[PDB]
Each structure stands twice: as C-alpha cells, then as structure tokens.
Amino acid sequence: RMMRWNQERRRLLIEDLEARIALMPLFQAEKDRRTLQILRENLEEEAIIMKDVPNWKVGESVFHTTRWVPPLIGEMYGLRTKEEMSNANFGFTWYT
C-alpha cells in the first residue's frame, strides 16, 4: 500500500511542479518589471537626495563590466521603508 500510495503521491507532485513551471514565465516577467521599477524609484530618489554631493555620479556600477547584474536585496529595498526591507530579509524565515 505504501508503495502504491507514494507512487500516486509522486504523480500529484509532478503535476504541481509542472504547474509552477508553466506559470514561471509570467512571474519572471512581473518581477523583472517590478525589479527594474524598484531600482528606478530608489535611483530617482537618489538624484534628489545625493544632489549637492560633489563629484557625485548619480550612480555607477560598483564594478567595471557593464553587464546586467541582478540587484542585491538591500539595493532594492535599502533606501525604502525599513519594514519593506525587513519583510524581505526576515520574512520567510518567519512563516506566513
């Protein structure tokens, strides 16, 4: 019975993973836009805040290469409301 039950359970599992797989294209998309937007929002504010700073390039890749590099959590939510940052940082370890 255990052999048959887990084989069934496995069939249900493959289905659910297949399900996310299908929806992954979308989420990838929404995130991409959200993420890019997030940066722009904080970056836009950066222009306002670090405005009078001398020799202050509004922003510049800490690196030399010019290729897109995924933004670290801090960068995205750093200048944002504290909580927002906390949520992301300690928001999974702490269950729903």
Binding site: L12, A19, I21, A22, P25, E30, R33, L39, E60, T65
Partner: protein, 142 residues
C-alpha cells in the same frame, strides 16, 4: 550610468489574479500561449539581462490576458467553482478538488476546444524559433 529602463517603458496591463486562480488554470495556460511564454523565456535565458526581452514580457501577459477573457466569456462559473474550492486548501492541492476540476475541464473542451494536458507534456523541453539570435558575448566579457 545604469541605463535603467523608464516606467512608461515597463507599464503594461496586469494579470493580478489570486495565485489560486492561476494554479487551477495553470495547466490550460501552459497549453494555450505556450509558444509566446517560451519565446519570452528563451530570450530571457540567453541574454542574461531583462533590458533586452521586456518587449517579449509585455506580450506574455497580453496572451495571458485574453486567455482569461476567453474563459470569462465561456465556462467562467465552472472555473469560478473550481478556483474557490482550490483556494480553501492551504497548499491549494489539486486532488482535494477533482469533481469541480472535471466539470471545468470538460466544459472548455466542449466550448473553447482547449484540452487539459495529460500527465506531463508540459515539462518536456520546447523548440521555439525567435528572430533575435544569441549574442556571441553574452557575459560581455573582455
């Protein structure tokens, strides 16, 4: 600079439906629109950046959007019953709801003509040909 795209460039209609809604229609979505879903994805993997493939991303939600409009036009309440029961469960498990699933699945085959994809046949790798060709310097390395 950072050449971060502008908001107007990244503003497009949103699906915004409860994740549960999606999981219930997930299988069919994976069926309907899979070609544009994969093209956005194929552009997404090669060119590491999201700067390049956002045009494709707007298309992906655009398909999804009419996918939903068609189900609202026909077989909306069979779907409505299926999602509500699916949402109640904590892990939104598919097997707790099979009676609702059957009526939702049978209708849309009857009216939309779509089909629930058999176990598998969504995981299998797809071939989608896209105009833009892979860039020889993806990492843009010296």
């Amino acid at each position: 600079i950072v050449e971060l795209p502008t908001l107007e460039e990244l503003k497009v209609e949103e699906v915004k439906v409860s994740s549960a809604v999606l999981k219930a229609a997930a299988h069919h979505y994976g069926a309907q629109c899979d070609k544009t879903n994969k093209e956005f994805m194929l552009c997404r993997w090669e060119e590491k950046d999201p700067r390049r493939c956002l045009k494709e991303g707007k298309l992906v939600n655009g398909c999804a959007l009419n996918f939903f409009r068609q189900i609202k036009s026909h077989c909306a309440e069979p779907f409505t019953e299926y999602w509500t029961c699916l949402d109640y469960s904590n892990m939104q498990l598919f097997r707790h709801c099979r009676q609702q699933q059957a009526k939702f699945d049978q209708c849309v085959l009857d009216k939309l003509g779509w089909v629930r994809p058999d176990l598998g046949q969504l995981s299998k790798v797809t071939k989608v040909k896209t105009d833009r060709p892979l860039p020889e310097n993806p990492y843009h390395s010296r």
